[PDB]
Amino acid sequence: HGYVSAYENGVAEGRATLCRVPANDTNEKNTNCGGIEYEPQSVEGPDGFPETGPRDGKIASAENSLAAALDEQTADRWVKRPIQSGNQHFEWNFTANHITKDWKYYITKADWNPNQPLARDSFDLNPFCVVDGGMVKPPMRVSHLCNVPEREGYQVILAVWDVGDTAASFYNVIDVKFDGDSPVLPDWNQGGQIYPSQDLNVGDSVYTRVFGQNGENVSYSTELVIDSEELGAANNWSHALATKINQEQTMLQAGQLNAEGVISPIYGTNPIYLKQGSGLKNVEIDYKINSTAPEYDLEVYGLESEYIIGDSATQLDLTLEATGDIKTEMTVYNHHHESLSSHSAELSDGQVEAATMTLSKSEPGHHMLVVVVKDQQGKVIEQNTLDFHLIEEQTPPPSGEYDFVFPEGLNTYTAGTKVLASDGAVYQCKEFPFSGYCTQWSPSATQFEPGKGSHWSEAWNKVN
Amino acid sequence: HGYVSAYENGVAEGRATLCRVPANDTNEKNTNCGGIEYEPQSVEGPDGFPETGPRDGKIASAENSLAAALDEQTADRWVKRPIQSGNQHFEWNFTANHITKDWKYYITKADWNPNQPLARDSFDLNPFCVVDGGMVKPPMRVSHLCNVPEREGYQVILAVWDVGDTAASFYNVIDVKFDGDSPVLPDWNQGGQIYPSQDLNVGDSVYTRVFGQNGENVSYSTELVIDSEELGAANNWSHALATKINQEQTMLQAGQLNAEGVISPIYGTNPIYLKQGSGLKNVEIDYKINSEATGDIKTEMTVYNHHHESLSSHSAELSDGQVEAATMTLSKSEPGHHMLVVVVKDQQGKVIEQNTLDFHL
Ligand SMILES: [Cu+2]
Ligand SMILES: [Cu+2]
């Protein structure tokens, strides 16, 4: 397992890598990558490319469901890293340095289509770089000096790591940009981004906060009012805000550079550029959450003040009153802040569902029931922590002239425990620190036995 | 706008920072932070702490709805960074360096309850560190030397950036771990993590791939079948997989280091530890997904022109068999080659297929 990285001399991070690790200099990150954002080292698929490997359209994901989002291909879907012709360092970062057959790097054809899914027809199937792995393990991080062909604009490099001891290969497509000469818009500098950060509701609004020579200046501010359910989609209002920004402002434009070096809004992350000589240096995004919010609440009934440790694991029998459409999460912690139980529940408004929690450990002491209340969209609304205790079963009141018939209950003998011995007499366990000897007995080691052991004089005392 | 970071001499990143930027050495990240993960520099709220400002239970979010997820407080919700007593360097990374009044740092009381929402009663309101801002703009990245008080175990440091040109401050809680000097579990070393990477469905499964001296060895593998809708929740099968790993394997254990130091599975990110001398090197996680509109789909369509510029869009969450009507208007009706990209996802948002049709005007 491993991914194309740029922690050292690497020229560009892979697409899946940028789903988790911000870019080397621009601090950019790919958006909406699915599960692969947690494990970018896992873009693994059948080997044999290009003859028989991942089928067309599934190259970027290597047919792995975890990385299926990477298979989307448009001119502005992915962060593009700058690259130059000629020799470049391609860096791999491994979490499991498998025995390697070889590495191979393919670049798209000069006139490839970026709005078409990645296919064999899109690439120069003759790799521009091959590194014999030698069927040995590499270091946990390696780099390959590769002669990158001459290109222009948006290109994609496919880095294939052929694992030597499996039938699989790791595929990492890389979104690169061949700029070089002709600096694209030298009079415009990026100072912010419109990330599709969240979905918004009707009544909400998203607006910009431009930072210049005199702090924030609301003359350049743009506000977009979410007036439709479809405009609430993170990609939608990001495109609309960038569009409204370009209508109302002149010293700043929002959107991705297209093939003509013209800033055009996209349905994703829209960078914000600042005109040189305007004094602007940074733009940030803010939100007005003015949509009518229901009065969310959760009521937990049935939590006893004390729970007696019984035969089985202690059990919480609770019921929940849900005010508003909420999503609840409950967890049980003990005296030492250790998790013992959990219960998720996507309740509706007014729904009275039953909850039942089993403690993984039923030990005495202070316990806590943490209750996290979210809405149907997952926003944390409130947290409440209720207290309760677990107690050991109360010993019965003392009765008779002793407590056990030796050796019954040998494990519980403490300072003052009276026992009946085989000689018909009563012996009391001596106090500190001799009470530890009252527990040591076995049919083989019969010392400390009251009336029979050779050393019971130090452990027990005959009662009268 | 800015956040507590550790790009240079910073001793520990802030909680919101770890929602976006991996840890310095451990590569860890906080999970399920909401929209704040895109903009960790935006945890901004009213000033005046602790007399006024963010109310109790909203300190970590500064009452910003964008950062509402940070207000949850349990013993194992957040990634904790090791720290020591005495003088330590705390680093701020600014995206907009506002005129600054001061920076103030507060640390939780020694016997604070990490399962209670963060409140003023949780913190020592006498700040252990105050840095003058001088009502001037700071550099784009600064560090402050602060005398961190002696603590043990899980603590939280609140870093307050009070800017001078607004009535707002930036609040960054920092999850720290006073590990002392005795290394906990020297015969155990982390070699993988179980991230709550996705929700699973009934019939799916999740399993481990244990990399050792001779590649992957399936004798060490553990598999968890998702047999109920509740177990399909990411935090649910993560904890269950970590639990099942501990039942079946002796050379590797899964879970966090609790207050008792033992490896205990949590309902979040579970690191996987490897017994020193076992030969194991790394553990990865894999998934079996064994569970005109054909099927319940969610579609996304976009129009591109000759020069790869977006001109129209149309989302539609169709059902099975539903034949709905679509209407797209081009923002530019110019001659040349055009493309219509059609992205096919499922009701859960997983990309299934993309088709690009060609046409001319
Ligand atoms: Cu691997
Ligand atoms: Cu700011």
Curated annotation (Swiss-Prot), chain A:
- Look up the domain of life of the source: Bacteria
The principal location of this protein is secreted
Annotated ranges, domain Chitin-binding type-3: 415-456
Q: According to the UniProt record, which cysteines are disulfide-bonded? A: none
Pfam families listed in its UniProt record: GbpA_2, GbpA_D3, LPMO_10
GO CC annotation: extracellular region
Domain Chitin-binding type-4, by residue range, is 7-178
What are the UniProt keywords, alphabetically? Chitin-binding, Secreted, Signal
* InterPro entries documented for this protein: Cellulose/chitin-bd_N, GbpA_2, GbpA_D3, GlcNAc-bd_A, GlcNAc_Chitin_IntDeg, Ig_E-set
**GO MF annotation, one:** chitin binding
Where is this protein found?
Secreted
- What are the transmembrane regions? none
What job does this protein perform? Probably interacts with GlcNAc residues. May promote attachment to both epithelial cell surfaces and chitin.
The family classification in the record reads: Belongs to the GbpA family.
User: Cross-referenced PANTHER family, in alphabetical order?
Assistant: CHITIN-BINDING TYPE-4 DOMAIN-CONTAINING PROTEIN (PTHR34823:SF1), GLCNAC-BINDING PROTEIN A (PTHR34823)
Q: Which NCBIfam families does UniProt cross-reference here?
A: PRK13211.1
Protein name, entry field? GlcNAc-binding protein A
Query: Which species expresses this protein natively?
Result: Vibrio campbellii (strain ATCC BAA-1116)
